[PDB]
Amino acid sequence: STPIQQLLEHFLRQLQRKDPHGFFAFPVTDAIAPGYSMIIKHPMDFGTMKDKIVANEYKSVTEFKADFKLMCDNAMTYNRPDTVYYKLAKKILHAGFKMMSK
Ligand SMILES: CC(=O)c1cc(-c2cc(C(=O)NC3CC3)ccc2C)c2ncccn12
């Protein structure tokens, strides 16, 4: 409800439109991605980011952007480059960093 919450909710809504399949909508579990929890130490996803906005855990755009980058970096580390997840992570990271610099 704070100004920062309002702005981050705006960014998050526009970012989620760039992931229409919801590959980033909720945590990647091992049942979806074998061995994921043994490769990725600090998982992140849009659903957790929403939860953190609501809990007022972000105090700046820079902190929100860092979680967004973590989410996309995780996908590029776990997934090979020829996969849809690696490619989407690269594409939305660019979109989001452009959007949060405007
Ligand atoms: C972010 C990430 O690394 C990730 C996300 C998913 C994922 C895939 C689907 C799906 O239905 N895919 C088939 C349509 C092509 C649905 C929901 C999720 C969360 C995933 N699956 C395997 C390896 C990595 N991932």
Ligand 1 center from residue 36 Cα (angstroms)? 11
> CA-CA distance, 68 to 71, in Å (whole number)?
5
Experimentally, the structure was elucidated by X-ray
Give me the DSSP letters along the chain. Answer: --HHHHHHHHHHHHHHHT-TT-TTSSPPPTTTSTTHHHH-SS---HHHHHHHHHTT---SHHHHHHHHHHHHHHHHHHS-TTSHHHHHHHHHHHHHHHHTT-
Decide: 33 in ligand 1 pocket, CB within 6 A. yes
Per the structure, the complete domain to which residue 11 belongs is given by: 1-102
Residue nearest (by alpha carbon) to ligand 1 atom 12: 23
Q: What is the CATH number of the domain that holds 10?
A: 1.20.920.10
Please count the residues of the chain.
102
Decide: 46 in ligand 1 pocket, CB within 6 A. no
Residue with the two structure tokens 């980033």: 24
Considering its fold, how many domains does the chain have in total? 1
Other Cβ atoms within 10 Å of 52 Cβ, number: 16
Residue pair 58/68 in contact (Cβ under 8 Å)? The answer is no
**80: which 2 tokens?**
């090979």
Residue pair 64/58 in contact (Cβ under 8 Å)? The answer is yes
Residue pair 49/67 in contact (Cβ under 8 Å)? The answer is yes
The set of residues, in sequence order, having a beta carbon less than 8 Å from that of 45 and lying 6+ positions away, is 24, 25, 26, 27, 28, 71
- In this structure, which amino acid lies at residue 92? I
> 56: alpha, beta or left, given left = phi > 0 and alpha = psi -120 to 50?
left
